[PDB]
Structures are given as C-alpha cells and as structure tokens.
C-alpha cells in the first residue's frame, strides 16, 4: 500500500533505522517517492544516515534515483560531504556523472562546498573533471571561487583545464581574483593560466583585482 | 538591526549554504546569499503536513550580494520534530535541500539587566543578569560570565552558569581596579543545540584596596 | 625527564631554530636540532666579558634528529642584560647568530602541593597550593587555575591569579558534581617574559548536594 | 678610540638609541668590529632596532660588511624576518646575492625560515632564485623541506628549477615528501616536478613517503 511508502519516506528522513526495517519488513516500497519524485534513498543521503543508506541499498533501492530537479541521490550525498555514503553508492553503480537541472555534477558540488575527499573519489571513479554546468561553469571554476585551495590542486592535477570558461568567458583566475584568494591565484598562474584573458566585459583578472581595491594581487597579474 | 548582527555571524560560518536559525524558539527565518541577478520558490514540509509555500524575501548586502530569506510563520514553527526545506529556481532547477530540526538553530539575543555588586568583603563581587528578553525556556539556558581588566590585562576570568542560574559570585579580584563584566547565554544539550549568544552589555566596578 | 617536556614544547614553535629558556633563572640551556651526521662550537659573551666557550652534548632524539644543547654555568647566568651566542661549524662557517636575554625566556614547572576544599557553605571551594618548587621570584608569579567537570563538561572555569598568591576561592559550582581543578605558573611582566608552565597534577572533590 | 667602538658594539646590541648618538657624535668607528668582525650594523640588523640602523647607516656604516663567518648585515635581517632592515639595507646598496662560508645567500636563509615576505622583497631586488649552498642546497630545496607553501609558490613563478638536485641528488620533491608536506607536494608535482627521479641512495619521493610510513603522499606518487 501507498501509505507504508509515505510512512518509509518519514521514517528514512527522520533517521529512523528501526522504523525504515519494520515498514520494509511489511512490504513497503523502497523506491517510494514524494511530490518531489525524492526516494527514501534521497532522504536518507541528505540526513547522512549511512545506516539506513546500506539498509535501503540492501533491499533494491534505485542507486540511481532522481527527482524532479534532477538531482539523485549522489547529488545530496556530495554536496552535504558524505564521505562514506558517497563511497557505498558509488559501488553500487551510482552514476558519477549524472547532472541535475543546472548541469551540475556531484564533482561540481563538492567543489564547490570544499569536500575535498569527496572530490577525490568522485574522480577516482570516472568523474568528468572538465564538466560544464548550465552556466559553463566546471569544478574549477567552483573551487577557484570559494577558495579551496586543495581541490584546485587536486583538479588540475587530474586534467582540469586551467584556461577554461564560463557562459560569461570568466576563467577560474577571474573568479579567485574576484573573492581574493591569492594562493589559488599563484597555483592556476603557475598551472598556466591565461592573465590575459578577459570576460564577456573586457576586463582581466587584473581589472577585477583594481575594481574590488585589492593591491596584492593587482602586483601578481601583470 | 540585531538580526543582521546574527546573520552575518552565520553567513562566515557557511558561505553558499541556506543557514536556518531561531531567536526565541516562536519563529524560524532560514536565508542565504549570491550574486546578482519571484526566481526562487521556498517549500517546505513539517511533520506529515502538505507542502507549502514559504514567502521569500529580497533585499541587498555588501558588495552587490542579494540576500534572500522566508521567515517561516508562527504557526508551522513546533520544535523537535523534522522540518524539510527545498529552494528550487523558476525553471524547476534545484538550489537548497536541507532537513532541519527547529530546536537545533537557537541563536539567542544577549542576556539583559546586569548589576555587578562588590559584596561585604574586599575582592568579592556579586553579578546578576536577566534571561534573553522575551525568549521562554529560561530554565534552559545556560550561561558564561567574562571579566576583563583594563590596562591590557584583556580577560582575566570565564566562569559557565548553570541551567537557570541568573547569579554569578567572583572572587579572586585585584584591589583598586577596574574590572568589567559581561555574560552571554546558550540553550543547554540535549533538548536544544546552537552557538553562545552575543555577550551582553557590559558593566564595570572599582574593586575597593586591598 | 621533565626536561624533555619543555623542550618538545619549543621545537614545535620554532623548528630549525636555536632555542633558548630558563627553568629556574638560576641556569640557562640553549638547543637546537637537525639531521644526521665535537663538530659545533658554542661561544657566547655576556655584558663586557670575554667570549667563552660552552660545552656543546650531543643526543639523539624523535627519527634520527640529533639534538645539540649547552647548559651555561650558574656564573654566567645574570638576568636583566645582553647575552650574545654563536654556535659555529668546525669549517668556521656559520650556524645561529642571537642576541637574547636571560630573564624573557622563563618556562617554569608547574605549580606543586594542590590542596582542593569545600567550603561551609555548598557551591565553594577553596583550593591552595605552592609555586614551582625552588624557583625563586615567587612574589612575581602569577597563576591561572583551570575547574573541569565530568561528563564531557570539559573545562567551565578559568581563572588568573594575582602575582605572589596562591589562593584560589571558586563558586558557581553545580552540586553532586566531580570537579577537578589544576593551576599552571607564569612570570609577571615587565620584569620576566615567557610562557605558561604545564598543568599541575590535578585534584578532585565530590561537591555535596545543592 | 677603540674604547668608543666597543661602547658602540655594545649600545647597538643592546638597543640603546640614544647611546649610539652620543658615542657617535664623540667620533665613534661606526665601522668598529668585535673579534668576529661584527660591525654594530651587524648587531643593529640582528636584533631587529630599525631605528639604529637607520642611524648607523646615515653615518656611514659598511653596509655589505661581513664577519668572518661571512655573514652580513642583510643574512641577518633575512634569517630574522626584520622586513623594514631588509628593505633600508637593500636601497642602501646591500648585495643581495652575498653568500657566507655556507654558500648560503639572505635568500636561503628566508626561504628556510619562513619569510615570505622578505623572500619576495630579496627576489624583487634581484636575488638569484636558483642560487645554490655549499650543499648544493637551492632556496627552494629550504622552502619545500621546511614546508612554507607560498615561498614555494613565489619562488617557482620566480623560475626556481622544480628539479633542482642538491649535493645527494635530492628535488624539492624529496624533502617536501621527506617531511610529510602534502600540498607541496602536489604544487611541486604540477610545476613539472620530475617523480621519477632518484636521490644518490637510489630513492625517489614515493620511496620515501613508503619508508615515512605516509599512505597519502604515497598514493599521490606513483
Ligand atoms: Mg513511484
Ligand atoms: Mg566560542
Ligand atoms: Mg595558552
Ligand atoms: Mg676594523
């Protein structure tokens, strides 16, 4: 029946390891889903409960699952930094380079919220490191502008192209100038990042250095 | 005003993330911040109740950064249960999804009130405070004093209060100096979880000589 | 012994580095430590005296680092002025070069002979001790006592203690409580710089019921 | 006298401002050595008193003197992290590429210590980036071992030789993965550092991170 599905998606987002066992044990739908087309799997990935992950995983739950925006389990596991239930769904043959509505793969957003063990073993299992999201954005670009110093490393290190660019011809050097990260800055000059380069405005990673005031690294971009 | 004072504390702590926190355990304003540009929809679930809608608001901060936030109503705001949060574009492209638990975001206001005493005797001081205004669960937070001495002494003492405890006695005190006092306040484990409260405003005692 | 406990605690603050400190201010030992293979020579001059040479062990420690130290004698260990140090390589090359002073690198032992007590009346405690034993200067140490509670409390108060005093009165304490308390040493200023001295050994008391 | 060049030797070292004016202006050598042929600019720039370096220097002290373990004025400002002496010696004509009886220059001594200011300000003067010690031992050989990631950073964007070996055959790569410093390890890596390369024992970088006991610098050579 339908309600011990919606009885399953409460218990897996409310951490319930017992109650998620005792509903699947009475024939509940593991790959029940919400409005949202959200699996308890989904749920339970978000709340970081790796327990009921191996348990739903266990009993056929649809690794690959996605809902209506696109994201699938992955997605939530990556961007929350879920170290160990980012490596159990990735074995069960979790698509690593699945893209929600925005493009974004679970590299993009583990890169972007800093998870750099995450960001390894997602391209340790094949994850696309030059991935353009629907803002042309790739990992890259996501690390270089919240300042993670260890995944631009990490990414450049495994073939990210250090010159690439955005809908906007914003390369990763524009976004570090831009939040002032000055050390991220040195690694993609010295990975060989086009200084020269500029946007869709005309304006380097120079020109943005002199507009946001900063005199350091208006010294290094000559 | 004093709510910006909290969100920017947050926003340090979590940048490109949806923080969600609560003032007097009556509300709930979850907000984040981006770049510049009804784009965004808020819905949420709490507790086996349909999906509604949060209404969100937009006003600018800092450097050309737009600052969103849905200050969810008194009415969907019961505490320890879980309360699902989803912010998805207009296009149906996702943007947050969280499961948050109300009473585990307390941001407090400052406790109020200070009177600091000298007691009877030299080197004793007597501290009394009240409880973050209009804020329940008072038997719940606990609080710390800070006592700071001038002349670059900077903080000479931190002593935690108890659960309910609006007293605090000090002793230990240097003679013929201007000492200065503050207490912040925090809900106390395990019903409740978040940060220490801004510290109060301050007063000050010249200890007598000796 | 307990010397190795402070000289671990310099390396991590300044690796590759010639470190300097006193225990007691009635002696001085400078060290530094490298690599792998009487090589070096330590001289040193103090206040218009004639440069002298000092006695340079050498002692392996951690992964095949060597450790070279000099222990200047108790003659040459005026506080308050100019003392110049060389260490040189055989080949006449250089190694350190510093200028310090006897009294701004003081790492005392802890604090000895705690004494905690509870009071008449529920929710004090007096606790006693002594300074480092045979240090002199003991009107010009100063005191920092640390109250920890069980139960992953961790430590709820700490509190300075004046130059000189080794008495300590706390409050504020919760009852039917393990609290354990433990005091640390330091040398006032201006006249004497350094750090703080380790924990002492701690002791506990079992506060009654209120 | 020399009586007034001792009294001057010991009011620089001691920091006493107004002694040095006085015992200048009663004919002084500002010049004046010590048996190790320290000059008081030597102990001036040791102890980090600005102020009496200016002074000495305004009455004529040698600034490129050098005591017999041959260090100068500059080597000590340079080993102590004293950025403004670094910066007066310098326009007043100190050699920055001087070298004591360790073949040492001011810019391996802040490289080793740390200062990375001081290592721009020395590179921004003309310090030879690439410049080897009696032990073969380049600036970057110091600032990789010791683990200072932005003197790393500053002097490879400089053109410091990734693959520099010392007297034992040792890279950077070596002493950074000798002393467990990951990130340079990764920075060395993407400028071109060569993995495979072998010390005079037969070892390379990954031998090493094996014999640390490191895993995760292990992974990363290979
Ligand atoms: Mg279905
Ligand atoms: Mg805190
Ligand atoms: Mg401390
Ligand atoms: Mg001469």
Request: some cysteine.
């Amino acid at each position: 029946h339908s309600d011990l599905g919606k009885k399953l998606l409460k218990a897996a987002r409310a951490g319930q390891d017992d109650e998620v066992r005792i509903l699947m044990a009475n024939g509940a739908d593991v790959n029940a889903t919400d409005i949202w087309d959200a699996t308890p799997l989904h749920l339970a990935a978000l709340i970081g409960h790796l327990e009921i992950v191996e348990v739903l995983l266990k009993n056929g739950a649809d690794v690959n699952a996605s809902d209506i925006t696109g994201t699938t389990p992955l997605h939530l596991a990556a961007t929350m930094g879920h170290k160990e239930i980012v490596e159990v769904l990735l074995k069960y043959g979790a698509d690593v380079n699945a893209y929600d509505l925005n493009g974004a793969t679970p590299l993009h957003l583990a890169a972007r919220m800093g998870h750099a063990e995450i960001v390894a073993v997602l391209l340790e299992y094949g994850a696309d490191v030059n991935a353009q999201d629907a803002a042309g954005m790739t990992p890259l670009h996501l690390a270089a502008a919240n300042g993670h110093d260890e995944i631009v490393l990490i990414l450049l290190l495994k073939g990210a192209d250090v010159n690439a660019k955005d809908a906007a011809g914003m390369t990763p050097l524009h976004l570090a100038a831009a939040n002032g990260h000055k050390r991220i800055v040195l690694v993609l000059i010295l990975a060989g990042a086009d200084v020269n380069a500029q946007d869709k405005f005309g304006k380097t990673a120079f020109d943005i250095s002199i507009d946001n005031g900063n005199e350091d690294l208006a010294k290094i971009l000559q | 005003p004093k709510f910006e004072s909290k969100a920017a504390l947050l926003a340090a702590r979590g940048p490109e993330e949806l923080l969600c926190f609560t003032e007097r355990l009556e509300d709930l304003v979850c907000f984040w911040e981006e770049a510049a540009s009804g784009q965004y929809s808020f819905s949420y679930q709490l507790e086996d109740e349909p999906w509604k809608l949060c209404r969100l608001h937009q006003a600018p901060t800092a450097r050309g950064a737009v600052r969103f936030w849905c200050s969810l109503p008194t009415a969907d705001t019961s505490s320890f249960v879980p309360l699902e949060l989803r912010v998805t574009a207009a296009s149906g492209a996702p943007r947050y999804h969280r499961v948050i638990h109300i009473n585990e975001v307390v941001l407090l206001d400052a406790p109020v009130g200070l009177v600091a005493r000298l007691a009877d005797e030299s080197g004793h001081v007597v501290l009394r405070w009240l409880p973050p205004p209009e804020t329940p669960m008072t038997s719940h937070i606990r609080y710390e004093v800070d006592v700071s001495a001038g002349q670059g002494a900077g903080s000479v003492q931190r002593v935690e209060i108890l659960e309910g405890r609006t007293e605090c006695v000090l002793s230990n005190l240097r003679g013929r100096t201007r000492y200065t006092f503050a207490v912040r306040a925090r809900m106390a484990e395990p019903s409740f979880g978040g940060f220490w409260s801004a510290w109060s405003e301050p007063v000050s005692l010249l200890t007598p000589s000796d």
